[PDB]
Structure 1
């Protein structure tokens, strides 16, 4: 599957969400927009939410394979995550998820 992201390249940020990352880094998506820009976050301290495109990062689960052989866009609708301007529209909320377990550690 894919519950996290990993940057295979570094990109200079100068936007409102300007997030300076490095090549071959780990980052967890948080928001998404234009299915091109994703608001992820590092696993450091007081980090994120950092912005990261889908052309400079890959979706994975740090488990096995890559994107479980799926497209980032195909992995999006999968969870049916809300947009950035939609999700951020108001934190006050809560998303639910269906119970599903796979037969593979």
Structure 2
């Protein structure tokens, strides 16, 4: 129901090929930072001070908090849920805005 934070799950170990590509690990948990052509994703691991990076969609799945299954949904639908801005629209926001604070709710 509530949105504002989207995440994905690595079902396969990705291998950074590009010069800005990032490597991943199979059966891993991570969150998308952006999406390109609803084909590529802007990964951003914390395990290491770096990222973000480009990752394949076939190597990541979107699912809600649970054991780890596929309901049959898609990332695109989740992209419009978390207003997941395209890597192109993100890069545009980068160096555009400045660290700020926004209203936040509260509920145990």
TM-score > 0.5, shorter chain as reference: yes
Q: Following superposition, which runs of at least 4 residues in structure 1 exceed 6 angstroms of deviation?
A: 94-105
On the 8 A contact 1:26/1:42 being kept in 2, the answer is no
| CA distance 1:61–1:3, shift in 2 (3 Å) | farther
From 80, 83, 100, the equivalent of 2:83 is 80
- Offset of residue 85 of structure 1: 1.4
- Offset of residue 65 of structure 1: 5.7
Task: List alignment gaps of at least 5 residues for structure 1.
Answer: none
Distance 1:97 1:78 in 2: 22
Match of 2:81, SS?
helix
Q: How does 1:1-105 map to 2 (within 5 A)?
A: 3-63=6-66, 66=69, 69-92=72-95
On the 8 A contact 2:22/2:43 being kept in 1, the answer is no
| CA distance 1:102–1:87, shift in 2 (3 Å) | closer
| CA distance 1:65–1:25, shift in 2 (3 Å) | closer
| CA distance 1:70–1:42, shift in 2 (3 Å) | same
CA RMSD across the alignment? 4.2
Structure with the higher strand share, 1 or 2: 1
Distance 1:13 1:37 in 2: 13
On the 8 A contact 2:11/2:27 being kept in 1, the answer is yes
Query: TM-score scaled to structure 2, two decimals?
Result: 0.71
